[PDB]
Design a protein around this ligand. Structure first.
Ligand SMILES: [Cl-]
Lengths: 138, 138, 138
Protein backbone atom coordinates (compact mmCIF):
# COMPACT_ATOMS: atom_id res chain seq x y z
CA UNK A 1 0.00 0.00 0.00
CA UNK A 2 1.15 3.49 -1.05
CA UNK A 3 2.12 5.85 1.80
CA UNK A 4 2.73 9.58 2.17
CA UNK A 5 4.10 11.08 5.39
CA UNK A 6 4.57 14.80 5.93
CA UNK A 7 6.34 16.64 8.74
CA UNK A 8 4.24 19.83 8.87
CA UNK A 9 6.75 22.24 10.34
CA UNK A 10 5.56 25.49 8.77
CA UNK A 11 2.60 27.53 9.90
CA UNK A 12 1.92 30.01 7.10
CA UNK A 13 -1.18 29.59 5.00
CA UNK A 14 0.78 29.20 1.77
CA UNK A 15 2.43 26.08 3.24
CA UNK A 16 -0.62 24.72 5.00
CA UNK A 17 -2.62 24.70 1.74
CA UNK A 18 -0.19 22.25 0.04
CA UNK A 19 -0.44 20.01 3.11
CA UNK A 20 -4.23 19.94 2.74
CA UNK A 21 -4.06 19.43 -1.04
CA UNK A 22 -1.49 16.66 -0.82
CA UNK A 23 -3.39 14.97 1.99
CA UNK A 24 -6.69 15.14 0.23
CA UNK A 25 -5.33 13.94 -3.13
CA UNK A 26 -3.30 11.15 -1.59
CA UNK A 27 -6.27 9.97 0.48
CA UNK A 28 -8.55 10.02 -2.56
CA UNK A 29 -5.90 7.99 -4.42
CA UNK A 30 -5.97 5.29 -1.73
CA UNK A 31 -2.74 6.26 0.06
CA UNK A 32 -2.08 5.89 3.77
CA UNK A 33 -1.28 9.47 4.91
CA UNK A 34 0.60 10.33 8.11
CA UNK A 35 0.87 13.95 9.20
CA UNK A 36 3.29 15.04 11.94
CA UNK A 37 2.64 18.57 13.18
CA UNK A 38 5.68 20.15 14.78
CA UNK A 39 6.92 23.64 15.68
CA UNK A 40 4.86 26.23 13.78
CA UNK A 41 2.63 23.56 12.29
CA UNK A 42 1.70 22.31 15.74
CA UNK A 43 0.77 25.90 16.70
CA UNK A 44 -1.54 25.90 13.65
CA UNK A 45 -3.55 22.89 14.94
CA UNK A 46 -4.22 24.34 18.40
CA UNK A 47 -7.90 25.13 18.94
CA UNK A 48 -6.93 28.73 19.70
CA UNK A 49 -5.20 29.13 16.35
CA UNK A 50 -7.96 27.37 14.39
CA UNK A 51 -10.69 29.55 15.96
CA UNK A 52 -8.70 32.80 15.61
CA UNK A 53 -10.44 35.65 13.83
CA UNK A 54 -7.03 37.05 12.75
CA UNK A 55 -6.33 36.83 8.95
CA UNK A 56 -4.08 33.86 7.93
CA UNK A 57 -0.36 34.62 7.68
CA UNK A 58 1.28 34.42 4.24
CA UNK A 59 5.05 33.95 4.02
CA UNK A 60 6.61 37.42 4.21
CA UNK A 61 8.70 36.53 1.13
CA UNK A 62 5.52 36.53 -0.99
CA UNK A 63 3.31 39.16 0.74
CA UNK A 64 2.65 41.12 -2.49
CA UNK A 65 1.07 37.94 -3.97
CA UNK A 66 -1.06 37.10 -0.94
CA UNK A 67 -4.34 38.86 -1.76
CA UNK A 68 -4.41 37.38 -5.31
CA UNK A 69 -4.35 33.91 -3.80
CA UNK A 70 -6.79 34.57 -0.95
CA UNK A 71 -9.25 36.30 -3.24
CA UNK A 72 -9.14 33.54 -5.88
CA UNK A 73 -9.65 30.76 -3.30
CA UNK A 74 -12.63 32.34 -1.59
CA UNK A 75 -13.95 33.01 -5.11
CA UNK A 76 -13.70 29.28 -5.91
CA UNK A 77 -15.02 28.48 -2.39
CA UNK A 78 -11.90 26.39 -1.96
CA UNK A 79 -11.95 24.55 1.40
CA UNK A 80 -9.55 25.63 4.12
CA UNK A 81 -6.50 23.45 4.69
CA UNK A 82 -7.84 21.88 7.90
CA UNK A 83 -11.20 21.01 6.28
CA UNK A 84 -9.24 19.24 3.53
CA UNK A 85 -7.42 17.23 6.19
CA UNK A 86 -10.59 16.33 8.11
CA UNK A 87 -12.45 15.38 4.89
CA UNK A 88 -9.47 13.24 3.91
CA UNK A 89 -9.78 11.35 7.22
CA UNK A 90 -13.40 10.57 6.42
CA UNK A 91 -12.52 9.39 2.88
CA UNK A 92 -9.22 7.54 3.45
CA UNK A 93 -6.60 6.41 5.92
CA UNK A 94 -5.20 9.61 7.40
CA UNK A 95 -3.53 9.89 10.81
CA UNK A 96 -2.69 13.20 12.44
CA UNK A 97 0.09 13.29 14.97
CA UNK A 98 1.31 16.08 17.20
CA UNK A 99 5.00 16.37 18.10
CA UNK A 100 5.58 15.92 21.84
CA UNK A 101 8.85 17.92 21.95
CA UNK A 102 7.39 21.06 20.39
CA UNK A 103 4.47 20.79 22.82
CA UNK A 104 6.89 21.18 25.72
CA UNK A 105 8.71 24.09 24.04
CA UNK A 106 5.47 26.07 23.49
CA UNK A 107 3.67 24.86 26.67
CA UNK A 108 0.88 23.22 24.64
CA UNK A 109 -1.22 20.50 26.34
CA UNK A 110 -3.28 17.73 24.64
CA UNK A 111 -6.54 19.51 25.51
CA UNK A 112 -5.35 22.58 23.57
CA UNK A 113 -5.14 20.56 20.33
CA UNK A 114 -7.76 20.09 17.63
CA UNK A 115 -10.05 17.07 18.08
CA UNK A 116 -8.74 15.57 14.84
CA UNK A 117 -5.32 14.90 16.36
CA UNK A 118 -5.03 11.13 16.70
CA UNK A 119 -1.96 10.91 18.95
CA UNK A 120 0.98 12.77 20.45
CA UNK A 121 4.29 11.14 19.52
CA UNK A 122 8.01 11.56 19.26
CA UNK A 123 10.35 11.68 16.29
CA UNK A 124 11.31 8.03 16.22
CA UNK A 125 7.68 6.98 16.14
CA UNK A 126 7.10 9.10 13.10
CA UNK A 127 10.22 7.81 11.33
CA UNK A 128 9.00 4.30 11.86
CA UNK A 129 5.59 5.11 10.39
CA UNK A 130 7.11 6.98 7.43
CA UNK A 131 9.50 4.20 6.56
CA UNK A 132 9.04 2.87 3.06
CA UNK A 133 6.80 5.62 1.68
CA UNK A 134 7.20 9.10 0.28
CA UNK A 135 8.22 11.59 2.98
CA UNK A 136 8.21 15.38 2.89
CA UNK A 137 9.23 18.17 5.24
CA UNK A 138 7.06 21.26 4.69
CA UNK B 1 17.67 3.81 -12.67
CA UNK B 2 17.90 6.13 -9.66
CA UNK B 3 15.26 8.82 -9.39
CA UNK B 4 14.93 12.21 -7.80
CA UNK B 5 11.65 14.14 -7.65
CA UNK B 6 11.32 17.66 -6.32
CA UNK B 7 8.28 19.76 -5.48
CA UNK B 8 9.51 23.26 -6.25
CA UNK B 9 7.25 25.28 -4.00
CA UNK B 10 9.58 28.19 -3.26
CA UNK B 11 10.28 31.09 -5.59
CA UNK B 12 13.25 32.92 -4.02
CA UNK B 13 16.61 32.76 -5.77
CA UNK B 14 18.36 31.07 -2.84
CA UNK B 15 15.94 28.15 -3.11
CA UNK B 16 15.80 28.01 -6.90
CA UNK B 17 19.63 27.67 -7.09
CA UNK B 18 19.64 24.37 -5.11
CA UNK B 19 16.87 23.14 -7.48
CA UNK B 20 19.18 23.87 -10.42
CA UNK B 21 22.24 22.33 -8.74
CA UNK B 22 20.40 19.20 -7.60
CA UNK B 23 18.86 18.74 -11.02
CA UNK B 24 22.13 19.27 -12.85
CA UNK B 25 24.16 17.06 -10.53
CA UNK B 26 21.61 14.24 -10.42
CA UNK B 27 21.07 14.24 -14.20
CA UNK B 28 24.84 14.14 -14.79
CA UNK B 29 25.01 11.19 -12.40
CA UNK B 30 22.41 9.20 -14.39
CA UNK B 31 19.31 9.96 -12.31
CA UNK B 32 15.84 10.43 -13.75
CA UNK B 33 14.74 13.82 -12.38
CA UNK B 34 11.16 15.03 -12.08
CA UNK B 35 10.41 18.63 -11.14
CA UNK B 36 6.96 19.77 -10.09
CA UNK B 37 6.54 23.54 -9.95
CA UNK B 38 3.80 24.69 -7.65
CA UNK B 39 2.79 27.89 -5.88
CA UNK B 40 5.71 30.31 -5.88
CA UNK B 41 7.86 27.99 -7.93
CA UNK B 42 5.24 27.95 -10.65
CA UNK B 43 5.33 31.75 -10.71
CA UNK B 44 9.08 31.49 -11.23
CA UNK B 45 8.69 29.48 -14.47
CA UNK B 46 6.21 31.87 -16.12
CA UNK B 47 7.72 33.64 -19.16
CA UNK B 48 6.93 36.95 -17.48
CA UNK B 49 9.01 36.06 -14.42
CA UNK B 50 11.88 34.59 -16.40
CA UNK B 51 12.17 37.65 -18.64
CA UNK B 52 11.78 40.19 -15.82
CA UNK B 53 14.53 42.76 -15.46
CA UNK B 54 13.83 43.02 -11.70
CA UNK B 55 16.66 41.72 -9.43
CA UNK B 56 16.06 38.15 -8.11
CA UNK B 57 14.49 37.97 -4.65
CA UNK B 58 16.50 36.46 -1.78
CA UNK B 59 14.70 35.04 1.26
CA UNK B 60 14.12 37.99 3.62
CA UNK B 61 15.60 35.81 6.42
CA UNK B 62 19.04 36.04 4.74
CA UNK B 63 18.95 39.51 3.05
CA UNK B 64 22.24 40.68 4.64
CA UNK B 65 23.99 37.70 2.98
CA UNK B 66 22.38 38.20 -0.46
CA UNK B 67 24.97 40.39 -2.20
CA UNK B 68 27.91 38.13 -1.13
CA UNK B 69 26.26 35.22 -2.89
CA UNK B 70 25.06 37.12 -5.99
CA UNK B 71 28.46 38.77 -6.46
CA UNK B 72 30.41 35.48 -6.01
CA UNK B 73 28.23 33.63 -8.54
CA UNK B 74 28.36 36.26 -11.30
CA UNK B 75 32.15 36.32 -10.55
CA UNK B 76 32.38 32.57 -11.22
CA UNK B 77 29.94 33.02 -14.16
CA UNK B 78 27.79 30.42 -12.49
CA UNK B 79 24.74 29.58 -14.70
CA UNK B 80 21.24 30.70 -13.66
CA UNK B 81 19.05 28.05 -12.07
CA UNK B 82 16.83 27.64 -15.12
CA UNK B 83 19.84 27.25 -17.43
CA UNK B 84 21.04 24.43 -15.20
CA UNK B 85 17.63 22.77 -15.56
CA UNK B 86 17.50 23.19 -19.34
CA UNK B 87 21.07 21.90 -19.73
CA UNK B 88 20.15 18.94 -17.52
CA UNK B 89 17.24 18.12 -19.87
CA UNK B 90 19.68 18.02 -22.80
CA UNK B 91 22.17 15.84 -20.87
CA UNK B 92 19.84 13.43 -19.05
CA UNK B 93 16.26 12.46 -18.32
CA UNK B 94 14.62 15.49 -16.75
CA UNK B 95 10.89 16.23 -16.81
CA UNK B 96 9.37 19.55 -15.82
CA UNK B 97 5.78 19.63 -14.67
CA UNK B 98 3.54 22.54 -13.75
CA UNK B 99 0.91 22.24 -11.03
CA UNK B 100 -2.61 22.61 -12.39
CA UNK B 101 -4.15 23.70 -9.04
CA UNK B 102 -1.78 26.61 -8.51
CA UNK B 103 -2.36 27.69 -12.11
CA UNK B 104 -6.05 28.17 -11.28
CA UNK B 105 -5.22 30.06 -8.05
CA UNK B 106 -2.92 32.51 -9.88
CA UNK B 107 -4.78 32.66 -13.21
CA UNK B 108 -1.82 31.26 -15.15
CA UNK B 109 -2.46 29.56 -18.50
CA UNK B 110 -0.22 27.05 -20.34
CA UNK B 111 0.81 29.74 -22.87
CA UNK B 112 2.23 31.79 -19.98
CA UNK B 113 4.65 29.00 -19.00
CA UNK B 114 8.27 28.58 -20.15
CA UNK B 115 8.77 26.31 -23.18
CA UNK B 116 10.70 23.78 -21.16
CA UNK B 117 7.58 22.73 -19.22
CA UNK B 118 6.67 19.25 -20.39
CA UNK B 119 3.18 18.99 -18.95
CA UNK B 120 0.56 20.40 -16.58
CA UNK B 121 -0.51 17.86 -14.00
CA UNK B 122 -2.07 17.39 -10.62
CA UNK B 123 -0.80 16.01 -7.31
CA UNK B 124 -1.53 12.39 -7.74
CA UNK B 125 0.37 12.42 -10.97
CA UNK B 126 3.42 13.69 -9.20
CA UNK B 127 3.10 11.23 -6.35
CA UNK B 128 2.94 8.47 -8.88
CA UNK B 129 6.03 9.67 -10.66
CA UNK B 130 7.94 10.14 -7.44
CA UNK B 131 7.12 6.78 -5.98
CA UNK B 132 10.16 4.66 -5.29
CA UNK B 133 12.78 7.42 -5.59
CA UNK B 134 14.12 10.22 -3.42
CA UNK B 135 11.56 13.03 -3.06
CA UNK B 136 12.10 16.55 -1.71
CA UNK B 137 9.90 19.56 -1.00
CA UNK B 138 11.79 22.81 -1.57
CA UNK C 1 19.10 -0.95 7.80
CA UNK C 2 16.94 2.12 8.66
CA UNK C 3 18.34 5.38 7.32
CA UNK C 4 17.56 9.09 7.48
CA UNK C 5 19.29 11.65 5.27
CA UNK C 6 18.70 15.42 5.57
CA UNK C 7 19.76 18.24 3.23
CA UNK C 8 20.22 21.08 5.73
CA UNK C 9 19.68 24.14 3.56
CA UNK C 10 18.24 26.51 6.13
CA UNK C 11 20.26 28.46 8.70
CA UNK C 12 17.67 29.85 11.13
CA UNK C 13 17.50 28.44 14.64
CA UNK C 14 13.90 27.28 14.30
CA UNK C 15 14.97 25.02 11.42
CA UNK C 16 18.27 23.88 12.87
CA UNK C 17 16.52 22.64 16.07
CA UNK C 18 14.43 20.06 14.12
CA UNK C 19 17.64 18.88 12.45
CA UNK C 20 19.18 18.25 15.87
CA UNK C 21 16.02 16.63 17.23
CA UNK C 22 15.56 14.38 14.22
CA UNK C 23 19.23 13.40 14.23
CA UNK C 24 19.29 12.66 17.93
CA UNK C 25 16.04 10.67 17.93
CA UNK C 26 16.92 8.76 14.77
CA UNK C 27 20.43 7.88 16.06
CA UNK C 28 18.97 6.77 19.39
CA UNK C 29 16.52 4.51 17.49
CA UNK C 30 19.29 2.80 15.55
CA UNK C 31 19.03 4.76 12.30
CA UNK C 32 22.05 5.58 10.18
CA UNK C 33 21.82 9.39 9.70
CA UNK C 34 23.44 11.43 6.95
CA UNK C 35 23.43 15.26 7.07
CA UNK C 36 24.38 17.40 4.09
CA UNK C 37 24.91 21.06 4.99
CA UNK C 38 24.38 23.37 2.06
CA UNK C 39 23.85 27.10 1.50
CA UNK C 40 22.75 28.72 4.76
CA UNK C 41 23.11 25.47 6.70
CA UNK C 42 26.74 25.28 5.63
CA UNK C 43 27.27 28.81 6.96
CA UNK C 44 25.78 27.58 10.25
CA UNK C 45 28.50 24.90 10.65
CA UNK C 46 31.45 27.27 10.14
CA UNK C 47 33.56 27.78 13.26
CA UNK C 48 32.87 31.51 12.96
CA UNK C 49 29.09 31.04 13.05
CA UNK C 50 29.22 28.45 15.84
CA UNK C 51 31.42 30.67 18.07
CA UNK C 52 29.44 33.85 17.33
CA UNK C 53 28.15 35.77 20.34
CA UNK C 54 25.27 37.15 18.21
CA UNK C 55 21.77 35.88 19.20
CA UNK C 56 20.48 33.02 16.95
CA UNK C 57 18.26 34.09 14.06
CA UNK C 58 14.59 33.03 14.05
CA UNK C 59 12.63 32.93 10.78
CA UNK C 60 11.24 36.47 10.22
CA UNK C 61 7.84 34.80 9.55
CA UNK C 62 7.62 33.85 13.25
CA UNK C 63 9.61 36.64 15.02
CA UNK C 64 6.74 37.36 17.48
CA UNK C 65 6.96 33.75 18.74
CA UNK C 66 10.79 33.64 19.00
CA UNK C 67 11.27 34.70 22.65
CA UNK C 68 8.63 32.19 23.91
CA UNK C 69 10.66 29.41 22.31
CA UNK C 70 14.15 30.61 23.34
CA UNK C 71 13.03 31.24 26.90
CA UNK C 72 11.30 27.84 27.27
CA UNK C 73 14.36 25.98 25.87
CA UNK C 74 16.95 27.64 28.10
CA UNK C 75 14.49 27.02 30.99
CA UNK C 76 14.47 23.28 30.19
CA UNK C 77 18.27 23.48 29.56
CA UNK C 78 17.56 21.98 26.14
CA UNK C 79 20.84 21.30 24.30
CA UNK C 80 21.78 23.41 21.26
CA UNK C 81 21.15 21.83 17.84
CA UNK C 82 24.85 21.21 17.16
CA UNK C 83 25.35 19.53 20.56
CA UNK C 84 22.46 17.19 19.73
CA UNK C 85 24.21 16.31 16.45
CA UNK C 86 27.62 15.69 18.09
CA UNK C 87 26.05 13.62 20.89
CA UNK C 88 24.23 11.62 18.19
CA UNK C 89 27.58 10.87 16.47
CA UNK C 90 28.88 9.44 19.72
CA UNK C 91 25.74 7.36 20.28
CA UNK C 92 25.07 6.12 16.74
CA UNK C 93 26.06 6.18 13.07
CA UNK C 94 25.81 9.84 12.05
CA UNK C 95 27.84 11.39 9.23
CA UNK C 96 28.07 15.09 8.55
CA UNK C 97 28.84 16.29 5.06
CA UNK C 98 29.57 19.79 3.74
CA UNK C 99 28.43 20.91 0.28
CA UNK C 100 31.43 21.58 -1.97
CA UNK C 101 29.47 23.86 -4.32
CA UNK C 102 28.20 26.23 -1.65
CA UNK C 103 31.75 26.33 -0.22
CA UNK C 104 32.92 27.86 -3.50
CA UNK C 105 29.97 30.33 -3.53
CA UNK C 106 30.68 31.59 -0.03
CA UNK C 107 34.48 31.24 -0.16
CA UNK C 108 34.53 28.79 2.77
CA UNK C 109 37.58 26.52 3.13
CA UNK C 110 37.72 23.14 4.95
CA UNK C 111 39.63 24.70 7.82
CA UNK C 112 36.72 27.10 8.44
CA UNK C 113 34.34 24.19 9.11
CA UNK C 114 33.43 22.60 12.47
CA UNK C 115 35.64 19.63 13.42
CA UNK C 116 32.58 17.34 13.37
CA UNK C 117 32.33 17.58 9.57
CA UNK C 118 33.27 14.17 8.19
CA UNK C 119 33.76 15.09 4.51
CA UNK C 120 33.16 17.65 1.80
CA UNK C 121 31.23 16.21 -1.13
CA UNK C 122 29.05 17.02 -4.09
CA UNK C 123 25.32 16.53 -4.46
CA UNK C 124 25.30 13.23 -6.40
CA UNK C 125 27.55 11.68 -3.68
CA UNK C 126 25.10 12.57 -1.05
CA UNK C 127 22.02 11.42 -3.14
CA UNK C 128 23.75 8.03 -3.50
CA UNK C 129 24.10 7.76 0.28
CA UNK C 130 20.43 8.81 0.81
CA UNK C 131 19.07 6.25 -1.62
CA UNK C 132 16.72 3.78 -0.05
CA UNK C 133 16.05 5.69 3.16
CA UNK C 134 13.90 8.59 4.28
CA UNK C 135 15.22 11.85 2.87
CA UNK C 136 14.25 15.41 3.84
CA UNK C 137 15.09 18.93 2.69
CA UNK C 138 15.02 21.39 5.60
CL1 LIG D 1 11.40 17.34 2.00
Amino acid sequence: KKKLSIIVFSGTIDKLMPVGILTSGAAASGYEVNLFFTFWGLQAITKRSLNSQQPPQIDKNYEQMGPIMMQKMQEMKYPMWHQLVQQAKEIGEVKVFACSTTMEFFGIKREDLAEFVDDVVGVATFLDRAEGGTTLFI
